Amino acid sequence: ACSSSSPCPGNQCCSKWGYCGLGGDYCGSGCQSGPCTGA
Identity of the amino acid at 34: G
The rounded distance, in Å, linking the Cα atoms of 1 and 39 is: 21
Angle 26-28-34 (CA atoms, 0-180°, nearest 5)? Answer: 75
Q: N- to C-terminal Cα distance for the chain?
A: 21
The rounded distance, in Å, linking the Cα atoms of 27 and 31 is: 5
Q: Report the number of secondary-structure helices (H) and strands (E) in the chain.
A: 0, 0
Residue 21 has what DSSP assignment?
B
Q: Which residues pair with 13 in a beta bridge?
A: 21
Experimental method: NMR
Q: Please, what's the b/e burial string for 21-38 (b: 16 or more CB within 10 A of its CB; e: otherwise)?
A: eeeeebbeeebbbeebee
